[PDB]
Design a protein around this ligand. Structure first.
Ligand SMILES: CC(=O)c1cn(Cc2ccc(F)cc2)c(C)n1
Length: 402
């Protein structure tokens, strides 16, 4: 019996920042977030008077518009002051006070598309060669080989960009939460990468503005407004953007498969919140790299025990198994990594419940397949509205039909 997935309106985006829909303004950098952000802004000349093109149905849309216009205005002030300050504390306007706070859903196709996008390779590297690991001593020879092979396959992976993006914004927000407790601080969303030719690049995805943050404990919430560039027209999948007000803010000139084209640039705005403990996990997202490697190392040490010989080279160079189901060893590494990253990006008690209880039903059907309710209500009580959980339930059902 397949799990019954819930009927209802399509599920909507709930990550802390854009994933496949993000857009970067970038520079080849010659280290202070706000200076880097302003230089990134200055690379774009297609800005225009912003307007709402997908309203937030439950929020105050004029306040989101006023908030983006305030960002541009206060950045314009910074540009007129002789020095550029290290940080920028927003005026406590009424639109920002409002925005900072002072049901069954069915599976939609977008979340699978997000996951496919996370597995892809980008044209830039997002981690250094020795990024993975915490070891006090030098690693032994086999451990080194395995980490180098693995890193070669995931260093350019889109899921790794999400890791580093996530690490940056969580560190910046958490640091601001105790260094500027009473300020509506403007926090640029930045990542850094290296192009195939070795050039260092600094990327701006947008900004967040934090609310008051007297975080007395791990579960105290700090609210924030995120404002994120995108080329995704929200009118194509409106259900995805239930939680957002979306602005059109510019026009960008692009190289494409039909030469130069001009496409509108959007700004995805929502209010959100996070806690000390979730920001600490966000700072730890590089462990996804380490957890994924360790799942690969289990597979290598299984083939190795059987062959009475270390199988690291034969595993990563694909030289007994007669193929790779996902098509390449590279795709297996990036698939494992994307699962770990999405578990972190989309963490929830629904995911936790689903993971524990679906594994129980897994082993039971495995033992029935090899040798021939209640647990179902436990799993299916986690199938409410979360895109990541619903997708994983959809995947589990394929593992059942097969
Ligand atoms: C209307 C609009 O959207 C707009 C956008 N810019 C670009 C800009 C703004 C602030 C900066 F600190 C750097 C660049 C300008 C000048 N107007």
């Amino acid at each position: 019996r397949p799990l019954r997935l819930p009927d209802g309106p399509p599920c909507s985006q709930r990550s802390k920042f854009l994933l496949m829909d993000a857009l970067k303004l970038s520079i080849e950098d010659p280290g202070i977030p706000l200076y880097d952000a302003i230089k990134c802004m200055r690379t774009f000349f297609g800005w225009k008077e912003p307007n709402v093109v997908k309203p937030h149905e439950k929020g105050i849309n004029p306040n989101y518009l006023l908030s983006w216009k305030q960002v541009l205005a206060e950045l314009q002030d910074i540009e007129n002051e002789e020095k550029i300050p290290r940080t920028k504390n927003m005026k406590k306007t009424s639109q920002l006070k409002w925005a900072l706070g002072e049901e069954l859903r069915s599976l939609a196709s977008w979340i699978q598309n997000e996951f496919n996008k996370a597995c892809e390779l980008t044209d830039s590297s997002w981690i250094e060669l020795d990024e993975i690991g915490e070891d006090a001593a030098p690693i032994e020879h086999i451990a080194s080989m395995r980490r180098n092979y693995f890193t070669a396959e995931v260093s350019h992976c889109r899921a790794t960009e999400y890791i580093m993006k996530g690490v940056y914004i969580n560190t910046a927000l958490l640091n601001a939460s105790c260094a500027a407790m009473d300020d509506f601080q403007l926090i640029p969303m930045i990542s850094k990468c290296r192009t195939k030719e070795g050039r260092r690049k600094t990327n701006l995805y947008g900004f967040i503005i934090k609310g008051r943050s007297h975080l007395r404990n791990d579960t105290d919430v700090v609210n924030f407004v995120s404002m994120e560039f995108s080329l995704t027209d929200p009118r194509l999948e409106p259900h995805k953007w239930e939680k957002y007000c979306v602005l059109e803010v510019g026009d960008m000139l692009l190289r494409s498969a039909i030469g130069h084209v001009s496409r509108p640039m959007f700004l995805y705005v929502r209010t959100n919140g996070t806690s000390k403990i979730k920001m600490k996990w966000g700072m730890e997202m590089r462990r996804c790299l380490l957890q994924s490697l360790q799942q690969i190392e289990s597979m290598i040490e299984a083939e190795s025990s059987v062959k009475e010989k270390d199988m690291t080279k034969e595993f990563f160079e694909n030289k007994s198994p007669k193929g790779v189901e996902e098509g390449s060893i590279g795709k297996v590494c990036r698939t494992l990594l994307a699962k770990s990253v999405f578990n972190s990006l989309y963490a929830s008690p629904q995911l936790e419940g689903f993971s524990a209880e679906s594994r129980k039903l897994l082993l039971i059907v495995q033992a029935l397949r090899d040798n021939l309710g209640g647990l179902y209500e436990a799993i299916e009580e986690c199938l409410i509205n979360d895109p990541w959980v619903l997708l994983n339930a959809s995947w589990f059902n394929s593992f059942l039909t097969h």
